Design a protein around this ligand. Structure first.
Ligand code: KVS
Length: 203
């Protein structure tokens, strides 16, 4: 399957005998599933993102079938709003990011998909994040009257400033669109600009 990023990349998974919906998230190191039973030895972990940290239970060697592809690995169980399939299991299903092109790279997920971007004249590092609706960057100055917004992740909500029609180059591909500026843990390129540079998920 090639999955476009016009909407959230939600797929059916099978885990612990149960069928669930989960978001394919290149911006997640780990896989985080809603409160559920996994008999097995577990250990406590805290994981973080936008809004802060949540406490989860770490189970290992849990089989997870993702759109009919078998994977097995570590699953973190806790109060997430959205079941998230992260890179630990995406790699096992041979998921890549691809920008269409006689060019456009193919990016595997064994390491975080970090890229250089140019925004406001400034080179920054940012994570290609299919789990993010929007693009969120650390405090910087951009032009415009910005609308304050709140966005959430996972650990809660944060306040951001919204800037619209901002040029952004992402590994050399041109985008112009909405950028949210605020206290994000990591600079993230979300689906609003991934779609502009032709990015798809591919198994
Ligand atoms: C639980 C909500 C969906 C999860 C994604 C996660 C993520 O954007 O991929 C981020 C990106 C990096 C940190 C910012 N990844 C993470 O948050 C993950 N963190 C990590 O992988 C690492 N943590 C750190 C600190 O980097 C690791 C060391 O623990 C965790 C899931 C834990 C594995 C997320 O936070 N998406 C937001 C991004 C902000 C945005 N505005 O786009 C989003 O789409 N939010 C929307 C909708 C939220 C979901 N809505 C829904 N109906 N399900 C919003 N408007 O509030």
């Amino acid at each position: 399957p090639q999955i476009t990023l016009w909407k959230r990349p939600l797929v059916t998974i099978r885990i612990g005998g149960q069928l669930k919906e989960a978001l394919l998230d290149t911006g997640a190191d780990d896989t985080v599933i809603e409160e559920l039973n996994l008999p097995g030895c577990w250990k406590p972990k805290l994981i973080g993102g936008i809004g802060g940290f949540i406490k989860v239970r770490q189970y290992d060697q849990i089989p997870v079938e993702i759109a009919g592809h078998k994977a097995i690995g570590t699953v973190l169980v806790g109060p997430t709003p959205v079941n998230i399939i992260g890179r630990n299991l995406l790699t096992q299903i041979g998921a890549t990011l691809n920008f269409c092109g006689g060019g456009g790279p193919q990016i595997t997920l064994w390491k975080r998909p970090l890229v250089t971007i140019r925004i406001g004249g400034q080179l920054k590092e940012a994570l290609l994040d299919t789990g993010a609706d929007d693009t969120v960057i650390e405090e910087l100055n951009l032009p415009g009257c910005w609308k304050p917004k709140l966005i959430g992740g996972x650990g809660g909500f944060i306040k951001v400033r919204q800037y619209d029609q901002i040029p952004v180059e992402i590994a050399g591909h041109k985008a112009i669109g909405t950028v949210l500026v605020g206290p994000t843990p990591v600079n993230i390129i979300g689906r609003n600009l991934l779609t502009q540079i032709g990015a798809t998920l591919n198994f």
